[PDB]
Amino acid sequence: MMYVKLISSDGHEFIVKREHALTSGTIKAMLSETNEVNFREIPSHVLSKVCMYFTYKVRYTNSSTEIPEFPIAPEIALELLMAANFLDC
Template structure:
């Protein structure tokens, strides 16, 4: 697969993220949080999905002196947009399948993202 091409699994996960956000917006229950990658790319997700991360949860639910809790925007100067997108996909995967009975679908990770994703997951406490 060439760089920039998406696998079927990636397309399915992006579809899952879009559908979850659309459902939350339609129900009026979406509290948006903006995650900003190192190149300025912004990804808007539901606050509930963001709270999968222990680090983000601390920033958003912590004392009001955290600017992130006031602005609902979190910048990640060390995380690329590709890795941040995969992290967001995992947040929604985790939300959907936590306490899910039965077989869980595989969460696919592209080998070229594995090391950066591991470092991001460690920092984000996911």
């Protein structure tokens, strides 16, 4: 498959499938011409949760099957929100 790379502010590089990342129009526009995207304001403990949300959304969109909750630990709840607010995820 086709993979792209998302780099956090603290240097962590997450490699995710292109189709999974293209659910977000923000990442889709950030790609266009590139397979590498750098997020200088999103730390790894947040961007990892973002990639997890990518997988969760691709798996559970359009399911009669019981959809589980997406877990958010309190310690990241603020920063993730800000990240989400900046990416419209």
